[PDB]
Design a protein around this nucleic acid. Structure first.
Length: 149
RNA sequence: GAAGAGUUUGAUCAUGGCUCAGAUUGAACGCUGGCGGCAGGCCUAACACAUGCAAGUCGAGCGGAUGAAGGGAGCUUGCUC
């Protein structure tokens, strides 16, 4: 995917006996416009490399999110750590109505009327985790029930 | 039919409060003002109140007060019976 969206930069420090050396981590996501989302950040010294040291793993771990076509599969109940995420599908005409790190991951999946939320912790380090566990178990038909409905 | 930021730390994560975007009113206040239409205008002292006005109506319900006119009598057109 080439439809990358930057999530957050955050100015990391750590201390040597000489003094404080600073480093930048920056998480970005990568999607294909049809639903293969990826994750990752990089540890470097500088801004323009830590977003492509994010691409170092963002093209990795890409998994085809099982869409329906422009609309999400279900009302969602999901969590990682101390972040919890609610989602439900919308109908036709509303655009991006998620927030912060939720508009990055749910816009590269091909769905546009998203209506996603954040509960518990709001840390974007652990926020993007609960969003993909919200999208990892999507199935309209892939249940093993011996019935189409 | 539901958007979050900033802020504890050398940095992190979590629990957790603060401050912020918004929309609002019977509005004030600081500013500066061209007009129309519909509106709304003691939120406080149910505090004291000058002044005028806010419910008088009826004579075809009844007694009783006053005499429009007009037609005449005298004096002679002033006056009254």
């Amino acid at each position: 995917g080439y439809i990358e969206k930057l999530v957050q930069v955050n100015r990391v420090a750590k201390t040597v006996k000489g003094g404080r050396i600073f480093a930048f981590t920056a998480l970005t996501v990568v999607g294909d416009g049809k639903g293969r989302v990826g994750f990752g950040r990089g540890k470097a010294r500088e801004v323009p490399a830590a977003i492509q040291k994010a691409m170092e793993a963002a093209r990795r771990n890409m998994i085809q999110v099982d869409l329906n076509g422009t609309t999400l599969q279900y009302p969602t109940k999901s969590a990682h750590g101390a972040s919890k995420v609610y989602m439900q599908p919308a109908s036709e005409g509303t655009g991006i109505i998620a927030g912060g790190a939720m508009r990055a991951v749910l816009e590269v999946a091909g769905v546009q009327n998203v209506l996603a939320k954040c509960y518990g912790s709001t840390n974007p380090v652990n926020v993007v985790y609960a969003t993909f566990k919200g999208l990892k178990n999507m199935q309209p038909e892939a249940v093993a029930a011996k019935r189409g409905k």
